[model samples]
Target: ASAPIGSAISRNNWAVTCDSAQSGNECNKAIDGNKDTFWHTFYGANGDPKPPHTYTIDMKTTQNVNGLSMLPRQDGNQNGWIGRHEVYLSSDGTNWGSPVASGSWFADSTTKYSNFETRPARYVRLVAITEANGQPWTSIAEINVFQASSYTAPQPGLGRWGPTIDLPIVPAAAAIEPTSGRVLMWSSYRNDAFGGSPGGITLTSSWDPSTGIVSDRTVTVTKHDMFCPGISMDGNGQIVVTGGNDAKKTSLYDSSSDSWIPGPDMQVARGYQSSATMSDGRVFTIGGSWSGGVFEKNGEVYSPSSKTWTSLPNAKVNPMLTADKQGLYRSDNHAWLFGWKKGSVFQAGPSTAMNWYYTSGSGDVKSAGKRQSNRGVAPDAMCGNAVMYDAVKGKILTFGGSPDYQDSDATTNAHIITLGEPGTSPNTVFASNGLYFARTFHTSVVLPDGSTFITGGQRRGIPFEDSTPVFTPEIYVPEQDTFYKQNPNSIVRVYHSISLLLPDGRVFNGGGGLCGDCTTNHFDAQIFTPNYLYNSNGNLATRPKITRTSTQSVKVGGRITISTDSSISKASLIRYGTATHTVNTDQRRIPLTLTNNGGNSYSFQVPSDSGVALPGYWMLFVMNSAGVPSVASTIRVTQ
Candidate 1:
């Protein structure tokens, strides 16, 4: 018997009937796919059709079924819930054989599913061996038989749970610098052990994308406690970190010199604030509780051009932010933002509930239009969901956030916003039922292929809670709409670890810890090689190389040639990302249309969508037709 991969069962050819019908006409309602309608026994329509009344489904053709789902009567009694069942399959309507699968269904009115081995049967029957309540009548509302499939399971290391290695310190924050193949990690360790930048072990290290080696550790120079600070990357391929215990101060890490330089003062002194680098080369820092005990509801923008700071207009002052958010927007900009200018923000609870878009312009106040809301289940915010800027779909995706800030469920749900653009209100949808494991306090990195790589979180949501650390890394595939668990990390990563997708195809994971109570093994770093970096046998595969870019400075709306060593599938420019606080505005990937010129060379057009591929330093990666990527080449994106 042939079976389709794990997929939904086709119901068009399915006809269902019960041994006893409530109303002679009511039997049809059960198969109508309506929750209100159900297959009731004739007992009320009530006679006790004991030993089990049966609902037999005729598939019209033998379907290789692997599982079955039952939708309980929506308005019915829990006492009547289907508690236990045995499923029998047959090639003909009359020749029913032994049970193929049997199990106790959830003793409730909610929908539930059970699975069994693949069997080719044209007729499927559900025999009610036991009911939730001891009643004279036995019944089943509906039956959904599914096709047997093998695709749902993760491939080998794909979806496998486990972490690869540990980092040098509990990474309060981290960044993967462009061009130099180095990683910068920061943690808020303020004792005689680690502080400012030295004792705290906040350092920079050289990362070898090939062998997963994170070496050449060098302590960075700094003076403020950047505990839970906001970060972004400048056009110079340097690091921009702001807001922390020292609210007003901003630090810029110049990778060329491997040193930190202090930027101008912030208009508002904020701690635990959020930030994003804009298209105009200005970094926007939003509200957070400030040093003076103020909520600091307003925002400020830092322009690299002027080296100056300016205030953000209150949306309430303009009345563009609606009421469900009227008070909420002003109450707190406590969520995350990505992609679009007007409808790409996930507000407070830091969940997917509050989604809107806004812009800033000196002359026009850069005020926004009416904000939009999502449609599905909101991602929870316990430790906080790992968020990313989806450049391809121009949407926002956040995974692993919990419901309670303190006891937020260790979650694996991805709250996605389908970017409400222009006048289209943005709506959200829960893309999957949930992740393989419940995780919180994790970091998410967007790969050039437009998929996402999320790593480093704990099995628990509470900070300093004696919870098991989550070491199994995972990859979310957008094309296949599934997840693959990667190799496990060698150490623990909780409230303070960081993960980033380097210019090379590998991922760099660093930082570790439990926030206030820092411990040893907290100051270390590690690296990860993605599956695309390997062959079918799971060994390192031959990788393509980008020797250089014909032009180092590629202006917007123009063309540039990339000299590579292999035929290319696609070319993409990834912005310098800021990974911290489960929010990142700079983690965006701008796609380029590649024109192969043969001879291992390609020319591509740059986008005018500066909102995403903002004017700055970008990592250009060329992927082969096989999906493996090349070590990236750096390019300055200019207007």
Candidate 2:
């Protein structure tokens, strides 16, 4: 028999209801206002007669449903309880199946159970199995249904080679002549057609950024087998190379003449080594294996004016030398010498604690000393093929060389050591995770943005060991704290060459060994651009400010007074829409009127032009009282 019509009734130990069929719906008009609403149920205690209730969503027809969800509500009750609830689904909504997931008993006293996550379903139904024995009723809020897209999976290691170029020979050392914007590379080339078997040649190359291509031109310097070629360029655009099979000999290549002249001989002959040019125009050669099974401790400094070489004091024992504008720093400066001799890097001075002591009296190293704790034990291998980041935060970074085994390619342990002032200890900033291939006689350069670019070297047993070495230019970014291999589009595998960062922010990669029928030899030069630039925006807020004032009206030759928030020895006034000119002088305020150069405003002459503009607005920028220019600034210009 059917139950009698009532606002509420008890079923399965709970209160329930149905809209009147007369209201054009199944349940009570207040509870089921729409035709889609079939039934209404509530929970209440048994003593007071309210027990938990359950409702099922049964579908009559078969449909491809995409999404569905149920909403629930709770009102005030002293013992307020919904107990446990579950949802079930089936192919046809008509028959509810087993519960996919269930919720635990929830009480009004718990603050965290206020929110609920949406549950998905096809033929879905919710069952409220229990509640407090004497509590008031709980109600169903609403239900929603919709269609949505399905999920998809992703593939791994996709698009590894973004883009690349191909080259004929392996490139070794690379250098860029700042004045001429020429990138030079040295590669090992055999002149078999000319009677030589495996000889070395230096390749000169240039980069066209607009087209993303590197064109190489070979310059035949010598027939001697050159290895570990160290190159540097001067302010005068002279290219210098040190280290070759001939030992101790330095060669100077005059771009103006396309000819090479032998310079002075080094005090000790070295093959695998590194060199840096000082700010005062002298080249320092440091750390390499010299003749006689000796890793040379002392280095040679070449004086271009005198064409002579002077020997510096031996480096801290077993030190791999490299430098920035600051001074020469080494890998094992804090390590034990033979048994336990601790060493320090000092500048050339009378001071005993100087860590970078140079014999040339050029302030190549900074004053602050970076000290480190004891080296735990001798490295499993030797530290060679070292390079440093000299752009912003002064750091000397070293990579691949035997730490223990004389042969490093076979070893698994590889680490990166950072020498800086945040702390004295040589921090192992990067560990290879035992997956890095060991290498030696490689070239590394610190790009302008502070990322390290390392390429080529002998990694015994790796495929393409002789065929222009695998062209993988690995980049280490400090901020992201990660390393990624950059695809060198057309760079050949190279070793014993140099990687030089040009002032224009391009990396010149050239010279190294190539695969032969029996042995490996050097190839022509290649160019790689790492695209590093000084970010002015990042330092703008912290840069110093400059102020300026002048007479209301003046003749073309009159002067103006420039003042600054911070005292600055040198300053320049750039005119808008004209040549980017600079004034070099030590004056806080100077008076100089401008001459009209066919525009709205007049222009003044400065020492150099940096290709920037005036009047888009302009600002006075000042360095410290000592003469360094502030990053740069702009302010509005008045007529």
Candidate 3:
């Protein structure tokens, strides 16, 4: 029998019913095509209604039904996620036949689906036996029956999860070594969790993708716990890590030397802070209250040439504080910062209010106004994920966070931020479709093809706890401005998890739960092969190859000659990324405008503005007509 496709059967003139329903959540709400409103079993009207509740929909006419999909309520409560359920079909609406499908559904905001042999019926019924969380109530945001279709669910070819390999640490902080394409990761003093000793030694390790071998290292030179430190790649491609367990400490790792060297301390000690590398090659950092006493932790800059830290007194945190329950303690943690022109940094999030910080001299902070949500004013999105998915266009995508740092409900809200010119405010537009699931502590990686790989977050914003994890990953395509779901993974990546783009065009996803002896401590990592890596026939697609480049370094607005093995259609440059605390300001994709020069040679223009193409080492990827990307060539963008 064919799978389901096309528009769902009409809801008009159809009868939708449930055994019992609450006052506000009527049975007809299920077919309303809206998830915000739901059809929930009654707990108020006349005492509580228990399952073995039955919900049925009558199409009013005979139709071919092949599949069913159910979405749980999206109000952040985990009360009524349907668990064990059986679906049945009937021709006359009254006499139902044997069950068409039966199974226990996973509890998450992502829509659950069930498909069976095509059957001609006028009525469909779902029998809910229990709730996923053992609650007695049953609630549904939306439900639909599909007509007979030729479509099958996407398989591993579209995207596949490789075997999980053991790691030496929980990988709370991760950076890609530019020259070698190896992942350099670290946690606290221990491999799996923090040892609670201040200024203690940290455990560091490297995973070589080329050989699948992991090498371990212990760093006592910089006695920085580095658990929740701010991480970024400097202009010279040096990994700069600052402030965590040893809140005032600074550590620098040079890939060339393949060793750790201590840098100068920050003006203000902090943890859970965010940092961005500016156009002038200086690194700026601010707002970390996860440690360092949680007061007004302001901004500072680190200059590689001078090997010193300069405090930004005027770049205060008052204007960009979230209304977190913990006051300033949690409100100022993890500010979303992006390096713009010269020494200016754009703080886009965590707080509804946006601000611009100029790092020249004493530094200055200016209000850029508030960000807007789909409906009216926006709320603070603490611990949310944001990325410059399209740096050439000065566009950044921000999504999935909670008002409070922890113990609050996550939001599925997403916004596309178009950065304005120097001294102007950025424009924020609500995404047409937000996200499949509300998430916090999620990790997002920018693929070489320019789409985003989003994975591993809690539907409910509890840190280091795995009671409610969203395992399924989704890819956000910028061209379509839409999100498509991918195959699910078994691992629970929350809290301290990290995801970084690999040079070979795959994603390295791993690490969560670094708390000592916590049940959630995951001492492993998995590689994600994105959908673009496979053909329509569910096989590995042949990738485009870059044979040569005119130069490994280019100035802003300069043109570079690229020679490919075959004629290509598209190209882009993604800055090497370093991520910690769900923020990776170092990563941004700059789409290179290509000019055909014949003989499989093409000329690509770099962004004219230095702010749009920040100075750093970037991975250049070329795509073929099929959208398959080449194994990137590393290039440096200089001012």
Candidate 4:
């Protein structure tokens, strides 16, 4: 693998220094293409220069480095070369005061080489600890370092869909437990045909990740039927369910002790509202209905600190929500886009609409960036579709909705929405087309590399007489604006179906629908391993895992160090997903900044505030330099 290619190299701008100069012209010979002239400290003995003479190249600016090549003087084969030397890399020209790489380059005059991690560096130097063969005079006939190998952008292979692992119930709603990495799932009601224990069912149960076994222990609700509930995880990692069956009572489930508790009900009954845990330790629920699209405008906020619900001004509604005309006609609420914009709360489309609900202090309605003509929101994409914040992409992806919910249009597309600042509305275009799926009530799970996995839905709206539930999933790559089809799952998922991007990268789907051609319980609960889980040879890849982490909890502006078994190309922080009816406000991705010790250690700074990254529990992932992510290490994030 060590070939020669030095026809072009940046040899001018670097600062050169050595412990001993060898008197003349040799400074240039180190990089100067001549073996006739080379550096020799001219020191009479091995310890003359203290047994370690140093030579350095300070690039004066940052540069990415692959590895270096060293050759011996041509006069005598393998003569007077740096036999037991080490090459150190640095970012601030100082990690050299830190993370360093040491290796030997002796034994031959035929260009000895040293390869290390691909990273950005400002300083690289060869330290001659001991002379080769005890030669007192150190000789560096020729040394060369190739520019950083093109990073190739860690592209995933043409991934394939894996076989499905069936589960117990119709996984109507699913959430990834931060602490245990277990999946918590529930549905509209009890179904014995699917293996659920009969009798007043404890509203929630967990399913295993590897084998897809439903938990033997189940927990029931303290309130009403959890059908059509808005689920999320609080900052402290507690599962919070806001509404169900038009009931005001809320349910809180703590996965640690595996218990379910009841919380104060909202002033108004909520049925299909969406909730998100805010940075301020409150779960905000917006825009719900009674039975169907009954349209309840006013919403409530639940304070974890006080365990109380406060009434807030009505969500700013637009004509699109109430219209039944041609375009922009949808009655379902898009998952309330409850996000922080510059410390202010902003809500985007819920269903077939592009309205933005805005509020700041005291839950007072701020300026509404409403209307299709408005620049801050999305298009008329309807239900069975989803939207999530793509942290790295710095854009919100609004994809896959009902073209004509009266039935599947078989011709719907996904949109990549962009927002300006935190509080301002998105103002431009970042999409084209190839989006051929006419879906609604689906799930859009974010992959570690910033791509979105679009899965599960019906050929028509909700449940059609045709009983057509789509199994063909699609992977959407934003940067490329392209779609690649994946292998079909044998199970058919419908309107109530949900999928969670697991800590280990497997996709967990709680199958949907309760009627004709839909999964009740026995027919649902399946796990699909994505393409990133396999190698180019179609063999399962060994994943990197985090055995231990620095803290059980992380605060804003804090630092957390994580160690990995594999060298990672990127470090990211993502909140575990909470899914139901194509909506999950709890899921978000935050790319982290860090320094990795080749595959051994990764030290990174935590993200701050609700605007940057909303406070909650996050699954920290160390993505292998090979492009796959390790099993996530869960950590609580406090404001």
- Per-residue alpha-carbon lDDT of model 3 for 441-552, expressed as tens digits? 9999888877889998998888788768997888888889889888776567888889999998899887788876565666566778888888887878999889989999
> Which digits, one per residue and each the tens of the lDDT, describe model 2 over residues 176-247?
332233444444343111124243454343444334334555545543344344454422335557654455
Model 3 CA deviation exceeding 4 Å by range = 1-157
List where candidate 1 sits over 4 angstroms from the true fold.
Answer: 1-168, 189-223, 290-294, 313-334, 339-349, 355-376, 379-383, 386-392, 420-424, 466-468, 514-521
- Tell me model 2's lDDT, rounded to 2 decimals: 0.36
Model 4 agreement with the true structure over 431-522: per-residue lDDT tens digits: 45635566666677887767778776766664522256666788877668777777654445666678888888777765565442232322
Write candidate 1's Cα lDDT for 1-639 as tens digits: 011113566777678777777674265565776677777676643655665767788989867666566677776466346645666788888887655544344344645544444556788888766665656555445567888543233355442322223232345577766556666555554311233432222433343444443343443345555666667775555577776656677778777776777677777777556676665566766655534245434656677767777776552212222122223322333346443443123232353335343444431223222222344344335445444445545655666755544444566666555543433555555655547677877777778777777776766665544366776776777667677677664345565566676776566565555343333224434456677777887656788898767887877777898788878887788876666655565667777777878898889887766555566677888888988888778887876
**Cα lDDT for residue 252, model 1?**
80
Locate the minimum summed-lDDT window of 10 residues in model 1: 316-325
RMSD (Å) of each candidate, 1 decimal = 20.4, 27.0, 15.5, 22.2
Alpha-carbon deviation at 325 in model 2, angstroms: 34
TM-score for all models, in order of appearance: 0.65, 0.43, 0.76, 0.67
> By TM-score, how accurate is candidate 4?
0.67
**What C-alpha lDDT, on a 0 to 100 scale, does residue 485 get in candidate 1?**
76
Winner of 1 and 2 under TM-score: 1
Shift of residue 257 alpha carbon in model 3, Å:
1.4
lDDT of 1 at 27: 56
Off by over 4 Å in 2: 1-169, 188-226, 234-237, 254-259, 290-297, 313-357, 360-387, 390-392, 404-406, 410-443, 455-473, 484-512, 518-639
lDDT of each: 0.58, 0.36, 0.82, 0.60
Alpha-carbon lDDT of model 1: 0.58
